[PDB]
Design a protein around this ligand. Sequence first.
Ligand SMILES: Nc1ncnc2c1ncn2[C@@H]1O[C@H](COP(=O)(O)OP(=O)(O)OP(=O)(O)O)[C@@H](O)[C@H]1O
Ligand SMILES: Nc1ncnc2c1ncn2[C@@H]1O[C@H](COP(=O)(O)OP(=O)(O)OP(=O)(O)O)[C@@H](O)[C@H]1O
Ligand SMILES: Nc1ncnc2c1ncn2[C@@H]1O[C@H](COP(=O)(O)OP(=O)(O)OP(=O)(O)O)[C@@H](O)[C@H]1O
Ligand SMILES: [Mg+2]
Ligand SMILES: [Mg+2]
Ligand SMILES: [Mg+2]
Lengths: 343, 333, 357
Amino acid sequence: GQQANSLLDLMTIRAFHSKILRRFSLGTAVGFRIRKGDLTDIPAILVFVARKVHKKWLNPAQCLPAILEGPGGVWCDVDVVEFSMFSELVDKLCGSDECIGSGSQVASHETFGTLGAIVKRRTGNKQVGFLTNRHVAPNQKMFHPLPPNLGPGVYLGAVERADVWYGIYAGTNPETFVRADGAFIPFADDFDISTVTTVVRGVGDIGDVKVIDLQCPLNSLIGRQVCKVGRSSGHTTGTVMAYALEYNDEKGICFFTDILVVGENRQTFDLEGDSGSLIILTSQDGEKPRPIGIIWGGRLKLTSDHGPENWTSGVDLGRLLDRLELDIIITNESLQDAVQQQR
Amino acid sequence: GQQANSLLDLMTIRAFHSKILRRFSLGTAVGFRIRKGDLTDIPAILVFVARKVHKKWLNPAQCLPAILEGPGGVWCDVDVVEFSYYGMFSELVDKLCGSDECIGSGSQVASHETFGTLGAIVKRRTGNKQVGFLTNRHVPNQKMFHPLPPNLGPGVYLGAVERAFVRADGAFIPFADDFDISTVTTVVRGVGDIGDVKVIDLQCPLNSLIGRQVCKVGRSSGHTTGTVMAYALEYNDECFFTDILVVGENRQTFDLEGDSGSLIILTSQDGEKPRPIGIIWGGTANRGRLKLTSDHGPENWTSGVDLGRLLDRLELDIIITNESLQDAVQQQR
Amino acid sequence: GQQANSLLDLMTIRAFHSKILRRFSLGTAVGFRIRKGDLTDIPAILVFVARKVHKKWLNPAQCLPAILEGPGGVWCDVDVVEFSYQMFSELVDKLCGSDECIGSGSQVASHETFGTLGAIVKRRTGNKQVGFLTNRHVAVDLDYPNQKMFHPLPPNLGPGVYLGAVERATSFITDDVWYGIYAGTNPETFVRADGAFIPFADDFDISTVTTVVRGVGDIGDVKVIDLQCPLNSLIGRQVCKVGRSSGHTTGTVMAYALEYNDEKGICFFTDILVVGENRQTFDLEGDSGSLIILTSQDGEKPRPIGIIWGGGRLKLTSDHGPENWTSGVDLGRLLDRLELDIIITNESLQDAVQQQR
Ligand SMILES: Nc1ncnc2c1ncn2[C@@H]1O[C@H](COP(=O)(O)OP(=O)(O)OP(=O)(O)O)[C@@H](O)[C@H]1O
Ligand SMILES: Nc1ncnc2c1ncn2[C@@H]1O[C@H](COP(=O)(O)OP(=O)(O)OP(=O)(O)O)[C@@H](O)[C@H]1O
Ligand SMILES: Nc1ncnc2c1ncn2[C@@H]1O[C@H](COP(=O)(O)OP(=O)(O)OP(=O)(O)O)[C@@H](O)[C@H]1O
Ligand SMILES: [Mg+2]
Ligand SMILES: [Mg+2]
Ligand SMILES: [Mg+2]
């Protein structure tokens, strides 16, 4: 009966008790216990409650336990958490730059956001396009910086358009369930890809996607510093606080997202319009920063001294690329290789 | 014909001219004249008007006089004030709203219909001598929880509200039969130990109440300090009477919505314990402007229910030490 | 083929190229080129666009040229500007009803609207009535109990004295269809920013009126905006305004002769554009009608040049957000249009009052 040591361990304990944990919680996630506002190294399932109160005011047997035991004697802690812009860089991202890349504004007749990454299809026509958040509203036409009806811009491409077993074994509410996801926009045939850069302007050259391994120690992901560059807030930095967040409505889970990020220094990590931004691990030892997710477009009580903070939903990048069968392009050389290999 | 020297003097003068004063005012109160934004020592009837303008733009019949004489030649000043009915995050507020291990003055109390602040720990003077708490009376029992009622969130059941123009009033919630009173403290967190209620004497000099610094601890704004600006406020739109008027210090609001029921406490000027004089009244909590200086915009004002007169009418005694509280629990029948 | 050297030079160039300038812009004005957030001394036509973007995202049809040449070879620059279409003090308190006099900056209100008194004026001819000048409200219900001005409030809202009734606008050249077609106006929507004259009521006590501008002081005579003199007499000059909502503010004149577009043509014209100094707004709602006054950095008395017109992004630098802009009505031309003279001393007012017929 060993203590949990990985994201998978926490996720199976959380799943094993999910039906009961939804009875007294708004949702759950996995990470490290947060105690007196500070991150611990104690693996835990984070339980989100509408209002966190002292034990004395809870009904008998309404107090969440401190420990949970899953299959095989693997155990973990239980942690209760309450769930209640103008710069040179932003100016370049929104249309004043001579190149298009990560951070650039992308807009349709219906939505607007940030271009996350330049990617290519692994198979088939091997088209070169970009990756951004999947908006929750088929042939949606993407322009930078604005669609024709609102102002000038070039046509980038159309969003590529693409379950019962979720409601069966995950207990999702089929009427309301949404899993945070990304979308692939292949570049239109007549779009000039020589105007594309693989650099992230506010950070610099990035390395290849950092795959989130669910069996490695938790401090590989939880507590890591990240940054993002988006059209609305420019450059911001945050911390990865949790993984595999489940959110609950009255009849089951209604929201899942892979990554939870909180901005540093009680500052918001993202604003509306930053959805699609690349979530990047900042470099701690001199290596190139590596992306881990995409921002997907409530407040979180972390300190008792200050008010609740905004939180950010992220899509696991490595699993997104696998699901869409895409490769990230991180050099101009790789990009020119990808372009000439389009069929 | 001596000048007015007490609250009673001002009020008897005010009553004698009541109809005449209401004809061109939203309401009246008694206190000290406010001149060039500063409090004077000049006893005055405060006349509250929707919009204060220079006399040159007023018709003579609407211009208020500067002096009024009541029965027996007792006289006072008349002071015109622009007025209207219409118009956070800290360790302390967190404790008041549910994270503390005790319940007391400042603690959040809520029902399915209302929410506010617990003002004082009190007991019935006679009969069964039940121990309960005092808060504002909101304008079929309304049974109260800390911090939240079952339909909105977690909390312990405190008790049901006892039911006793709108006059500002407080209400007594006797603690439920199964409530653990050992979780109650008579300390006002953020202020300390308080002394006994300070009776508002209507015949002593005005400077005992008007102009005194006060503080309150409430679930919405934590600790704030202010000044008592007037007594015996009467309002008539076309309506409501409250005992105490407070304006927050440093052009900062004295209360926010949810602070109603908070204890209004005279700060200690010489080393004695601070003494309560009132309870914040709900309604007019967030609503209401008050022009005090022409340098700054209008300021918020707060309504207070006279505590000493509230306790008498409900026949309650305030409990101000945890020893007195332990005793009162043992004497309940 | 000389460079443009006056407002008239820039405006004739702008007219000669009206079709090209209007096809992809929200509007145009004339002034000095703005570069890297700063005013230059380069005469230019300002072209206002909803979003300013890099050349790489523009079709050659939509990319504006940097220079335009008109008839006779006279040329100028073209500058692209990103565009679009409550304060408490001792002064504001006096302006809103606590002062013992009425004058420029005082609050004036009707049953429907409120604003600022601009200037004390008199008719040149006829009965030579004394009154005041304020903005002409558009989209307002000007029917019998709505042209009645009071200070500070109308009888339904509070106390105040009756000042007079707004005189309907007698005109414009825009109303001539023949001229309108040549200028490209849309008749269905076009609005000319304008002022209005309120003659004082027969029983209004004019001895309660002052010609002083509180917060600035005594003013000189109206400064006529000359269209053939060098641009730096107006463009870039610092101005101030006293109004009921924001009290005293200072700004800079950024452009002249703004023409604003809609789907069919020109729908708004105003004479002056002002931007507040130090990234702070020049006006708030209710300051409309305030006198726009040239500040005197020399020792002469400040001179009025316009009136604030009432009821825009104008993003100038990349580090700061968009700034508000203010529409001003050319005072000298407004006075000519309404056949009015401004009264600038309290002795001169008494003369005009005794000279009323
Ligand atoms: N179902 C519930 N609803 C609301 N609050 C609860 C519930 N269950 C437990 N709590 C509160 O949460 C507390 C446990 O919080 P948590 O597990 O985060 O402690 P911690 O992390 O060690 O310390 P900190 O509170 O500083 O994080 C319990 O003592 C109880 O007061
Ligand atoms: N019915 C009324 N409605 C509105 N305003 C009035 C009315 N009657 C008097 N006033 C205004 O109130 C003024 C008197 O104000 P007040 O009594 O407050 O003077 P003060 O306190 O000595 O000086 P300050 O005005 O600085 O407080 C009068 O000069 C008049 O302008
Ligand atoms: N129709 C249009 N819509 C939006 N933007 C345009 C249009 N035509 C040109 N532009 C942009 O406007 C720019 C010209 O701007 P402008 O004339 O203000 O330059 P500048 O004043 O010398 O420098 P600054 O940009 O610092 O003012 C061109 O580089 C082009 O990117
Ligand atoms: Mg914790
Ligand atoms: Mg006064
Ligand atoms: Mg420019």
